[PDB]
Design an enzyme around this catalytic site. Structure first.
Site, PDB file in Angstrom:
ATOM      1  CE  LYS A  43      19.219 -65.456 -15.522  1.00 53.34           C
ATOM      2  NZ  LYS A  43      19.136 -64.342 -14.514  1.00 53.34           N
ATOM      3  N   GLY A  45      16.678 -70.457 -11.084  1.00 52.16           N
ATOM      4  CA  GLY A  45      15.640 -70.189 -10.079  1.00 52.16           C
ATOM      5  C   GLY A  45      16.188 -69.643  -8.772  1.00 52.16           C
ATOM      6  CG  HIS A 103      25.422 -68.359  -9.485  1.00 49.19           C
ATOM      7  ND1 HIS A 103      24.149 -68.882  -9.363  1.00 49.19           N
ATOM      8  CD2 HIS A 103      25.266 -67.063  -9.844  1.00 49.19           C
ATOM      9  CE1 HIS A 103      23.263 -67.924  -9.591  1.00 49.19           C
ATOM     10  NE2 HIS A 103      23.917 -66.807  -9.877  1.00 49.19           N
ATOM     11  NE  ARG A 125      14.348 -72.236 -16.180  1.00 49.29           N
ATOM     12  CZ  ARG A 125      14.165 -70.965 -16.517  1.00 49.29           C
ATOM     13  NH1 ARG A 125      15.105 -70.062 -16.262  1.00 49.29           N
ATOM     14  NH2 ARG A 125      13.044 -70.583 -17.125  1.00 49.29           N
ATOM     15  CB  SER A 133      17.264 -68.055 -18.672  1.00 48.21           C
ATOM     16  OG  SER A 133      17.166 -67.114 -17.622  1.00 48.21           O
ATOM     17  CE1 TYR A 188      12.430 -70.988 -13.076  1.00 49.05           C
ATOM     18  CE2 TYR A 188      11.187 -72.407 -14.562  1.00 49.05           C
ATOM     19  CZ  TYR A 188      11.480 -71.154 -14.073  1.00 49.05           C
ATOM     20  OH  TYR A 188      10.849 -70.044 -14.587  1.00 49.05           O
ATOM     21  CB  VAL A 226       3.393 -61.542  -6.798  1.00 50.92           C
ATOM     22  CG1 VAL A 226       3.885 -60.683  -5.624  1.00 50.92           C
ATOM     23  CG2 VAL A 226       1.865 -61.764  -6.773  1.00 50.92           C
ATOM     24  CG  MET A 227       8.385 -63.053  -6.822  1.00 50.86           C
ATOM     25  SD  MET A 227       9.523 -64.450  -6.675  1.00 50.86           S
ATOM     26  CE  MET A 227      11.102 -63.589  -6.808  1.00 50.86           C
ATOM     27  NE  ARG A 252      14.323 -64.853 -20.873  1.00 53.69           N
ATOM     28  CZ  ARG A 252      13.851 -65.774 -21.711  1.00 53.69           C
ATOM     29  NH1 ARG A 252      13.432 -65.423 -22.919  1.00 53.69           N
ATOM     30  NH2 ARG A 252      13.800 -67.048 -21.361  1.00 53.69           N
ATOM     31  CE  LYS A 253       9.754 -65.171 -24.088  1.00 51.23           C
ATOM     32  NZ  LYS A 253       9.516 -66.051 -25.282  1.00 51.23           N
TER      33      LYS A 253
END
Ligand SMILES: Nc1ncnc2c1ncn2[C@@H]1O[C@H](COP(=O)(O)O)[C@@H](OP(=O)(O)O)[C@H]1O
Ligand SMILES: Oc1cccc2ccccc12
Length: 288
Positions: A43, A45, A103, A125, A133, A188, A226-227, A252-253
């Site tokens: 979560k 990036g 990860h 992040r 997230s 991030y 865009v993504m 999400r945001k």
């Protein structure tokens, strides 16, 4: 049911049961000298930077970057789910130059990456935004155990009892590792504040000099607006059994500071007191 199972310890870290089951396949993964590894705590990036890298590799060509979903263009190496996906096999069958997602905590990374002295891009992040997230992601991405309530999940996160283990150790040990291997360590929040500057850092690290116009194409196509609508990047092509976007969308945001919407003041104060103790043995500095 391959979904919603309890996590299984692998070398001290809670991982999905099916990763544990296939661990020898991950440990023996064969890297290549020109692989670029994108390494993140969940979560932080990963998708954003993976899309940036694929855009760089395709000289900003949006159509070429729609040749397949991001999770096939940039395989999640250790993710193996019976019947469903095998990141190791996807990578074994991928022509160079490969972009690899992981990860894994530093100490679990397949040794071939070290032996091949690969370049690695690590993205971190701020912990409070990560846990928010991750809560919503646990809800929508069914491979995870049930997160429970926000309060319960926050406590599990602070204790490191979540998939891929504690955030604190993950970011700290990857930070220390930058002294041993070529690791571009990005934040991030810096990408949010000045994405052009951060993509220029990636380009320098990759030893690539591209025209300003191509840089601007890459910037445009890697923005959240865009993504989020791009079906090749937004995970909406995922099998519904794997991800239910009606629970929470993957895109999400895409902000910094959502933690303020989720944490109570008391949760925040408690989290900070705990954070200071855990982060005191590290030079790391984050912005929330
Ligand atoms: N282009 C972009 N710009 C900003 N944030 C992005 C982004 N693409 C994805 N994200 C955010 O990155 C997080 C997913 O990280 P990962 O790819 O490592 O799983 C999500 O955060 P939120 O849940 O806070 O919105 C997602 O919305
Ligand atoms: O990034 C991830 C972390 C854990 C599980 C995932 C499942 C699908 C796609 C991405 C995932």
């Amino acid at each position: 049911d391959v979904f919603r199972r309890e996590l299984v310890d692998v070398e001290g870290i809670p991982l999905f049961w099916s990763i544990a089951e296939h661990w020898s396949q991950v440990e023996s993964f064969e890297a290549r000298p020109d692989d670029i590894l994108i390494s993140t705590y969940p979560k932080s990036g990963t998708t954003w930077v993976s899309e940036i890298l694929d855009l760089i590799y395709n000289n900003g060509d949006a159509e070429k970057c729609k040749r397949d979903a991001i999770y096939k263009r940039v395989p999640f190496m250790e993710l193996i789910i019976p019947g469903i996906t095998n990141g190791v096999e996807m990578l074994n069958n991928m022509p160079s130059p490969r972009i690899v997602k992981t990860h894994l905590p530093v100490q679990l990374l397949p040794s071939s990456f070290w032996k091949n002295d690969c370049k690695i891009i690590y993205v971190a992040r701020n912990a409070k935004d990560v846990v928010v997230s991750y809560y919503y992601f646990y809800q929508m991405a069914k491979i995870h155990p049930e997160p429970g309530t926000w309060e319960e999940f926050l406590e599990k996160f602070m204790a490191g009892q979540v998939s891929f283990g504690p955030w604190y150790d993950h970011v700290k040990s990857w930070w220390e590792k930058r002294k041993e291997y070529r690791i571009l360590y990005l934040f991030y929040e810096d990408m949010k504040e000045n994405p052009k500057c951060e993509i220029q850092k990636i380009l320098k690290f990759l030893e690539k000099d591209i025209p300003e116009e191509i840089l601007n194409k890459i910037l445009y196509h890697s923005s959240f607006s865009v993504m989020k609508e791009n079906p090749s990047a937004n995970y909406t092509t995922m099998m519904k059994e794997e991800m239910d976007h009606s629970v929470s969308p993957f895109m999400r945001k895409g902000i910094s500071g959502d933690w303020k919407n989720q944490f109570t003041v008391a949760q925040y104060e408690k989290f900070e007191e705990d954070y200071v103790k855990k982060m005191e043995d590290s030079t790391l500095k984050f912005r929330s």
